[PDB]
Amino acid sequence: QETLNGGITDMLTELANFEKNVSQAIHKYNAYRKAASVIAKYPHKIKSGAEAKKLPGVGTKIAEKIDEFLATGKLRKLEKIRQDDTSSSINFLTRVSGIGPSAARKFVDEGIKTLEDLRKNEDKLNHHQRIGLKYFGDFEKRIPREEMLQMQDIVLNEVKKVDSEYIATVCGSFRRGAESSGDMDVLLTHPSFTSESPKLLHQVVEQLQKVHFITDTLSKGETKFMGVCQLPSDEKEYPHRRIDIRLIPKDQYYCGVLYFTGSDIFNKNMKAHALEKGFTINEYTIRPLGVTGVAGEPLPVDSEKDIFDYIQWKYREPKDRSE
DNA sequence: CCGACGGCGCATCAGC
DNA sequence: GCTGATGCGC
DNA sequence: GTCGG
Ligand SMILES: Nc1ccn([C@H]2C[C@H](O)[C@@H](COP(=O)(O)C(F)(F)P(=O)(O)OP(=O)(O)O)O2)c(=O)n1
Ligand code: NA
Ligand code: NA
Ligand code: NA
């Protein structure tokens, strides 16, 4: 419920962004995000820094910041950095996909501060950055679930057309049943591809380009594609969207699907459960741990269920994996 | 006090 | 031209 | 910045 502590969470999120994009302190970025998130879930309107400090992730300094915010309705440090031309410009440029803190700083140092300046300096942008600039606004839009379904329709159809033995699963928030998603993440496998066994990814990307669904490529190798797609349109045309496709060995596929469905909290919790049951699970495999902590060979996994069964957990519907 | 905090694929850079 | 590092975004 | 060994 935004209005509850929205001022605080907004404050912490802005601080997080400056740490990541300007100070290049990724661990402070994550600290602020963690604090913002735990506070976002706190079912009460916070009345003091001390009250917030009781939450894991909120420490001495953020408590102080909350006291200042509650007393004055702002934070001096944040007001200052907001009005800082160099800082605010660096922070802004990182909103372009492909421009990170390093590129943003370099651009701003040489007087390139706005999208207009970027537009004027194509020669100084790499391929990814040019695409990020081209679809700047579209990439910041969320994707309604209904469009995700139309997108899924196309992907599953074209994948099957290339080879009916491919298996493709759209993961991320969409598989968790979310009513909107930030992008589309497709996990792909094929019986012919295992850990102990190309063009499998290429043929799928190619077919999706052939029907004009994929419009641009950000990066592409033998196992990972990142690019851009658009649903077909006298109605207004759909925004361009980010799509990733990952080719994963068949024997590691379902660990992959589990992992890339998330959420992070759920993955963390399931990893914890697995441990106390004597198993180590990561993105790729689930392995038994010996009595001295030595990891055994990967266990056979032929479905998401197999994983749950190993750790004696009842199968959890993707829709029920927020925690 | 002081180290961990995720780490991997791909594009591109830096050094040789 | 090769190899490892870095930047970036998942 | 926060946590915890
Ligand atoms: N940087 C990352 C990100 C994700 N993942 C894996 C591990 C993650 O748990 C899993 C899902 O990512 P997610 O939960 O973050 C997300 F995308 F679905 P969400 O932002 O919540 O939703 P939405 O699309 O609406 O923005 O991918 C990862 O390994 N590394
Ligand atoms: Na705390
Ligand atoms: Na960026
Ligand atoms: Na960004």
A95 contacts: CB under 8 Å, gap ≥ 6: A136, A140
Considering the four listed CATH numbers 1.10.150.110, 1.25.40.10, 1.20.1440.130, 3.10.20.30, the one that applies to the domain covering A1-84 is: 1.10.150.110
Q: Which of the residues A20, A41, A45, A65 is marked catalytic?
A: A65
- List, in order, residues 6 or more apart from A163 with CB less than 8 Å away: A190, A203
Tell how strand A184-189 and strand A180-181 pair up.
unpaired
Ligand 1 atom at minimal distance to the Cα of residue A180 = 25
Does the domain at residues A142-259 carry the CATH identifier 3.30.460.10?
yes
Report the Cα A226 to chain-centroid distance in Å.
13
Experimental method: X-ray
User: In the complex, which nucleotide's C1' lies nearest to the CA atom of residue A98?
Assistant: C8
Residue A285 contacts residue A255 (beta carbons within 8 Å): yes
Residues 6+ apart with CB under 8 A from A211: A154, A158
List, in sequence order, every beta strand (DSSP E) within chain A: 143-144, 167-171, 180-181, 184-189, 214-220, 224-229, 241-247, 279-281, 286-288
Q: Measure CA of the first residue to CA of the last residue in chain A; give whole Å.
A: 19
Kindly list the protein residues whose Cβ atom lies closer than 6 A to any atom of ligand 1. Answer: A 172-173, 178, 181-182, 259-260, 262-264, 267
Given resolution (angstroms): 1.8
A49 is in an annotated binding site: no
Q: For strand D, is any atom closer than 7 Å to the CB of A270?
A: no
Q: Annotate A128-146 with b (16+ C-beta within 10 A) or e (fewer).
A: bbebbbbbeeebeeebebe
Residues in chain A: 323
Assign a CATH topology to domain A85-141. Answer: DNA polymerase; domain 1 (1.10.150)
Q: Is A189 exposed, middle or buried (CB count within 10 Å of its CB: 0-12, 13-18, 19+)?
A: buried
Name the β-bridge partners of A247.
A188
C-beta of residue A256 within 8 angstroms of C-beta of residue A246:
yes
Strand D near-CB residues (< 7 Å), A 26-85: 27-28, 30-32, 35, 55-63
Rounded Cα–Cα distance for residues A96 and A29 (Å): 18
| Residue A119, both tokens | 């537009």
Judge whether A9 and A46 are in contact, CB under 8 Å: no
The answer for residues whose C-beta is within 8 angstroms of residue A188's C-beta and 6 or more apart is A159, A166, A167, A168, A200, A201, A204, A245, A246, A247, A248
The full set of domain ranges for chain A reads 1-84, 85-141, 142-259, 260-322
Same fold, A1-84 and A85-141: yes
Residue nearest to nucleotide D3 (CA to C1'): A57
The helices-and-strands tally (H runs, E runs) of chain A is 15, 9
A260-322: CATH, from 3.30.210.10, 3.30.499.10, 3.40.190.10, 3.40.50.300: 3.30.210.10
Peptide bond into A263 cis (omega under 30): yes
